[model samples]
Target: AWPKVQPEVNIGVVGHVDHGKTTLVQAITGIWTSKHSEELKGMTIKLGYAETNIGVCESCKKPEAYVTEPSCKSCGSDDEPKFLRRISFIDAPGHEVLMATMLSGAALMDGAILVVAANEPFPQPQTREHFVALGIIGVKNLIIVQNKVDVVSKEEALSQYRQIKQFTKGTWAENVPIIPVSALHKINIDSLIEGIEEYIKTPYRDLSQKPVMLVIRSADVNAPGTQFNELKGGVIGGSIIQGLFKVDQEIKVLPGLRVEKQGKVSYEPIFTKISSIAFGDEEFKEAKPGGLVAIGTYLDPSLTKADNLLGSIITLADAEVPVLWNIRIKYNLLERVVGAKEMLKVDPIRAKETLMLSVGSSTTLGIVTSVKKDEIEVELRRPVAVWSNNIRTVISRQIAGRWRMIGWGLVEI
Candidate 1:
């Protein structure tokens, strides 16, 4: 097997939970879906990472050759084929409760592969909401994968295909490819890859801008039984959205160490050196945008363990990252509250009402301190790193003690 390289673009496998999103990712990348922690019946509970390079089958000219196999599975020819074109897949959790993670995952993506199972009628509630959320996120580069074709009738598949087209007719996903596939059976996966290539262009990122990377994951790579001195530095895993990061670069993480200010928990910045950076499981002296990477940092292992810094942003040591406490913003609300027992009417923002707020990957609570026509002031329970020029955020409401996304807003101050 040849060593893989950094992904050319990041694509998300998103849709209703248990619609076989992770299954498709595993099928494409050969990345073990069972490796992630907190597994419950095979559904992804967090932002799972997998990578694969697409190539063609010499015998059939099909791109379903995800791995370097000795035989072409599509045409049943005993011949090794060329495999290239590396891309990363972020398998965001599809459960409604994990929607914040999904939003964050989309923040790192150049495009998406929207999965919907043909076994179901079409537009399962999660699928509908997922599509709308992606629209709100403004992801124009997308393709719909009508999966589980093996389990549905030919007529049913045709019906579902029509439903998908109609549903997306006026949305951002309109005119996008909807490839019928059974990821389990490797049916039409080649076509799906072709659609991915056709839709997802190489993302444009300015490497000259100051580096900014959202911390999607952090952990101690060392084993519990390892000697204290032999233990390695903590590792931070995420994609750099801007600029470059080199080994030995001094980095600063926003909202790092926690503190209590006026009886509220807040975070202070932590400074560290990049001990190393790895791509495609190999260490590199420098890293760039478009792919997921693991950066070894000289920070306490406990601070990085269990995704404690999942939403923290890393940048040049001297760069300023916004640490918001009280914020005022103009906003728009969705017609109905999604991910609920019923399509409940969205309640007006009232003073003192706490709502779930996500800025980038940082998901937290915000209390409405003031409200006016289309603008409001909120006091957040935690701070998020928002660059001076970026203010887009998604805010959700508490429905039956659960966070349900209701609106998106922009910070005005």
Candidate 2:
């Protein structure tokens, strides 16, 4: 049996609310995403995550029996089980209130599974919006999953397929393959797995280049009752989009932590040596882009609590990530905003107006410093590590208290 390390990744599951996005995730990973407190309260108020692997069983067979690692569902045989590559899944929230969370998840994804339900009409608002967001962030690899076809009539399924084609026309997914499956019953899952593995390939990295990890979660692993001496150090969890980092390698965090001392706002530069690197339960002495890895660091535990370092960029000690207090962009505006209650026409940018910008895993407030027909300058409330030229991003403006996402942008050199 061949065993492979989980690669740099995250198969992003995205769709409109109540459209079986999470259900498809559960089917693949054997873990339901929405288990957080607020999510348990009945809606996905936050992003959820899980990990599982594709396993090939002898008796259960292929073309139908793709599954998470365990005995085959058909014969329950663990003997000689071939565990394929491990995969982590980011189940993006589809609720209107959680567009930002979805965007953050999308930025980290190498590829995505765009989930749509056969029971629903074509192109639900969140589905369309999520597709647009995927385009903006440049998630080019996608497999259109038409879920819940088991409950639909044969004619109904065909009708849904037509609707899917019509909606996807002229978009990036126009030529993408569509697979119909009932994730609830685990139907045609092997075909889904085959398509994903063949289409959404995990790319190999150039370890020679400078390493940059996009910080997504930071945590203090010290329990409330645990002893300080036995406690683990601060842990930063995220994915490396470029290059590689190894144990004992010195790394720098950009705009690390904002400290308000006395009357001054000081953004401190944080540095730490990588103590350990891990992907899921597998520990690695070195980490490269392919999947989520948690790096143990020398930073103080309190600094890492409650995701204080989320959205920060980590790089080699010698490299300086461009920290922008004010981002000047040659821009374009969308005609309409997504996630709005009504289809409100987007207005031109005005000076002193606040807008939200999401780049990579970072999201921050930007106030318009100046505006023009094709260019705009915004003074940032927080600095982002946008060191590269032409990093794609999404811009959103607050309308009626909630931020409604508008258009995409390119970072100018």
Candidate 3:
């Protein structure tokens, strides 16, 4: 049964590591990813690690109890009148070797909460790169969280806030509200949630007219008798890029492969019953655009892989690839510093080896057709799903002989 008239919107947390991204999520959800158990004192700090416990606030020993209902009668919290759709805090590593983790998280986000440290001044390298990455991913709805406000005086925080305001004046996030809060102290978290509700409540662009597509981030094969498989079934986590998915839908899994079995072509259409639908961990009967979902589909155990999880179905007709050329990009000064002069690696659908393109975070890639100061043209290695006419590309840079995020670029070619 559809409980709400509108669709649910999924929100994700992103920022440079140690800027208190996990802390902020813990403050809002009252569930700390760092704390593993009651015996573990303090919080665990690591790169590319996530505390995936989904217990209530009380179970996590949070000071406040998590009310399952939408309204908070005791705190007079009318800010969030609607039920909070499941929100996923994508805990990504800020260090090297985990840049792909951040990219994977960005690829599946509907909107994002850009975390910044109030103690730091504007134009920080990673901070600017995070903004550029969000922009590249087409994340327009942004909530700027100025974390660790308590670490500095109000005057200092305000001053830094003003500097941030000026820095983002011309960007997409310029109109976003910046909430100053101390994640450790749990100050101003309510305001942050309020802002999230406000931003996510805005209607999203309709994608009903497009062919169904999704990007699979994680996939696993399960033995029939495994306990984990029995409880949750085989799950795939990805975002629905186009069309919709409902129970008992017959879909095809492409697995990001362009060709298979000596040109015999592996087109597997699994007639599956959607056993369970969840955005984050909250169970739902249906899902739509702007939501990260785990679909429990009935399919062969071998079909699920890390690369093949983002599959789609054609309820009406088959999905067609778009024809496009090269993509042009731009990076800010800080983005250049954080993500410049790095190797660009791309894993094409049917290619045996990954292609490495280097131009900092703002380079053109594809079949080189033309090059001009203002723009460059090339044939794309693979077809990508564009939100508008804009092609979204991820730009990475090398730090200390390793590649990291410099920024993301949106180009039209």
* lDDT values for all models: 0.75, 0.75, 0.51
* Model 3 agreement with the true structure over 1-413: per-residue lDDT tens digits: 11332234545566665688767766766555443364235323332112122212222222232333344444544443333444444444444344555556565566778888887765555566667767767777888889999889989998988888898898777888888889989887656766766775634547565534454434211111111231434555455655677755555444233446776633343344566666543566766765445677665445554343324222322444332334444322132444433334422122222222322111223453454443434355543333345445554434466665543344563
Candidate 1 global CA lDDT score: 0.75
Q: After aligning candidate 1 to the native by TM-score, how far in Å is the CA of 377 from where it should be?
A: 1.3
Error of 3 at 269 (Å): 8.1
Better of 1 and 3 by TM-score: 1
Judge candidate 1 at residue 41 and give its lDDT: 60
Q: Once superposed on the true structure, which residue ranges of model 2 sit more than 4 Å away at CA? A: 1-4, 36-42, 55-62, 65-67, 70-84, 218-230, 306-311
Off by over 4 Å in 3: 1-7, 33-73, 76-91, 121-123, 205-207, 211-213, 219-233, 255-276, 280-283, 306-317, 322-335, 338-390, 397-400, 404-413
Q: lDDT tens string, model 2, 18-79?
A: 88887887787667766544534267665666777776675765655565665565656657
Two-way TM-score contest, 1 vs 2, winner:
2
Q: Which candidate wins on TM-score?
A: 2
Q: List the residue pairs that clash in candidate 2.
A: 7-290, 8-290, 8-291, 9-290, 9-291
Sorted on TM-score, highest at the top, how do the candidates line up?
A: 2, 1, 3
Per-prediction TM-score = 0.88, 0.89, 0.67
Better of 1 and 2 by lDDT: 2
Model 1, which residues run further than 4 Å from truth? 1-4, 35-43, 57-84, 219-232, 260-266, 306-311
